[PDB]
Design a protein around this ligand. Structure first.
Ligand SMILES: Cc1cc2nc3c(=O)[nH]c(=O)nc-3n(C[C@H](O)[C@H](O)[C@H](O)COP(=O)(O)OP(=O)(O)OC[C@H]3O[C@@H](n4cnc5c(N)ncnc54)[C@H](O)[C@@H]3O)c2cc1C
Ligand SMILES: Cc1cc2nc3c(=O)[nH]c(=O)nc-3n(C[C@H](O)[C@H](O)[C@H](O)COP(=O)(O)OP(=O)(O)OC[C@H]3O[C@@H](n4cnc5c(N)ncnc54)[C@H](O)[C@@H]3O)c2cc1C
Lengths: 129, 129
């Protein structure tokens, strides 16, 4: 059976997805580049980001990633935390991030770590993690 | 000055965006086709949709619409309601909706009406409505 592979395929493809959070009891969504270690997703951002404040107030997040109307994609539900591990920060660093961060040593660079509870594969089957 | 025009340009372009809602105190986002009357956005969906239940429980919604990493787009914050007006339903009907609805007379077809409070134009300037 191919669900983990179908999901990994999506996660191993294009990087831009949508990260949604709750912000003062209202939804907020932003385009973000996604990296990963196995099924754990990571987004590089500035530590003063409102998404970081959102996560500070409610850790539940939702991800749409992978997307013609009939392309396959995934939806991820899980809890987020902030990750400042130098090894992961240096691993994921790349020049597209220069829009928002200076360099891998920028003190403002943090990762949002998303620990998935449920991954739905659309085109739903799901994986519980 | 060109903000209303910049926004209308986005709203008059490709139709697929992201509709985010709050679902049991957690964020949820879905790809949806967007229609509009002036700056009021509408999405056609099935009346048993969980997005409808979400909106039933918290009317605040967020839209990303319009999107290369440096394409322009908009973010919309506002309150949603359900619209069953036959004139609008027939106006927006088209065959892409056949994935989710039978025909314009399908009793399951409703519109989600999004009354914007704030529209941000990204590439932010904003309009209050
Ligand atoms: C394809 C793509 C990929 C991207 N990838 C990344 C990424 O990997 N990492 C990254 O950091 N960023 C990335 N971005 C940028 C990110 O989507 C935006 O910076 C987004 O606004 C971040 O949301 P935030 O709440 O953290 O933003 P913040 O900068 O903290 O605040 C902006 C938010 O506040 C609100 N706002 C906007 N303007 C005003 C204002 N005038 N007054 C009051 N409120 C306002 C809006 O809701 C907006 O989303 C990407 C953008 C694109 C298009
Ligand atoms: C480009 C694009 C455009 C689209 N445009 C439209 C549109 O205009 N109108 C429309 O109606 N739809 C549209 N869709 C489909 C829409 O995005 C999905 O149907 C989406 O899941 C709707 O969210 P919902 O909560 O209303 O879905 P519902 O069908 O009510 O429920 C599905 C949701 O429940 C959760 N779920 C999924 N599977 C399970 C399961 N196995 N067990 C428990 N929970 C589950 C997921 O979070 C999922 O989003 C579009 C899709 C794409 C890709």
């Amino acid at each position: 059976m191919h669900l983990k592979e179908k999901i990994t395929t999506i996660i191993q493809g294009q990087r831009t997805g949508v990260l949604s959070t709750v912000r003062n009891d209202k939804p907020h969504s932003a385009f973000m580049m996604f990296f990963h270690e196995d099924f754990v997703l990571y987004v590089a951002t500035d530590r003063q980001s409102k998404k970081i404040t959102d996560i500070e107030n409610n850790p539940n997040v939702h991800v749409l990633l992978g997307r013609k109307l009939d392309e396959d994609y995934i939806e991820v539900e899980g809890l987020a935390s902030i990750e400042e591990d130098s090894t992961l920060k240096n691993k994921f660093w790349n020049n597209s991030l220069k829009r928002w961060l200076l360099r891998p040593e920028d003190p403002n660079y943090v990762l949002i770590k998303i620990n998935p509870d449920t991954i739905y594969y659309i085109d739903p089957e799901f994986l519980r993690l």
